[PDB]
Every structure is written in C-alpha cells, then in structure tokens.
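Annex B.
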Amino acid sequence: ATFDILNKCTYTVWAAASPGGGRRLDSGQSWTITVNPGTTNARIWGRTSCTFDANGRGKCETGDCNGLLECQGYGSPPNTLAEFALNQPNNLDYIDISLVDGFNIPMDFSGCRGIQCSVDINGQCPSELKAPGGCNNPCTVFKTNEYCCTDGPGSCGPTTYSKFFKDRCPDAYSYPQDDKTSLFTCPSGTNYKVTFCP
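VVTL1: predicted structure tokens.
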C-alpha cells in the first residue's frame, strides 16, 4: 500500500514511519511511502520541535525515535498514531488512529473511510496527563491495569481519563482494549492518506 503523508499544520512536523524512516515536512509539504503487504505493527506519526545535525541525529520534543531523523523504531509518547496492519486474513487491512500512546498533533487517516482526531486536545489536557507539546494517555503515565489492560481480555474498560480522549475523538482508540469502536478495516489494495492538522 502507498501512504501519502501531508503536513497542513502551520508549523513544521517531522513525519516518521515504522517501517519507512522519517522526513522533515514544513508547512504544506508531503512524503509518500510504500509499505509492503503483510506488514503488521506498523505506524505513522508526527514529531514536534525537533533539532537534528547534518547526520540526522538529535532530539524531538514529541515522538522522538532514539534521536534519529530517519526512524528505525517507535517514538516516545505523547504521539498521535495512524496504526495499520496490511493484508491480514480475508485480504483485510486493519487501520486505526490511536491515542493510547498519547496525542501531539491533530490527524486524519483516510482509506476506504476517513478517521479523524482534530480537536484541541493539547489546550484542554487534564493536568495529570500534560507533557511538553502534547497530552499523554493515562496508561503511559500511570502504570496500572485500570489504564493499561495488562491483566487479560475484558479486565479493563473506559476511565475518566480515557473518556477525556474518547469524548473528543470518538473514532480513535482511547485505551488499549477500545477495539469495538476504534478498529476499522479496508480491503487489501486500498491506499491511504495521513494528514496532519486536517
């Protein structure tokens, strides 16, 4: 599948992908990548307030991936995520926006349907969850089963903190087991667009 990733934010977003790497996107810029069928565990995000040297090493305020421009692994929360797994059984791609590793930049993820989390989550973030440049999920910050769902299927459910996210972005995962209303599929062969600040 192809992914067009577009920055419509008024500020530079250093886009990142696992797998795929990373690119500086100033306002209005785009980066198109191919992710092969069968890839699972994949994600596209944006990073704010980065600084990189001529070799691409440095540090981002949000979403930092081991201090590289061209990521080779996941970023540090808080980071809004476009998650996907391609060509799964019955020729299905499974897509979602997740807030389980936090929020940093508003996002639209579109394929056979549009998913969008665009409200001002940073401006409204509870003080328990605030981070520089974003809003953490309570699971990242408070490590208990109530928010992290480690104790098995059905052992957790929505909390006051996850409802903060879900009330604002009903279609994105707000806690780890938030699948019924956050996990979507498209037919394999669909191509995708991820847009920052839609």
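The CA atoms of residues 130 and 142 lie 13 Å apart. The two ends are 21 Å apart (CA to CA). Further annotation is deferred to the next reporting cycle.
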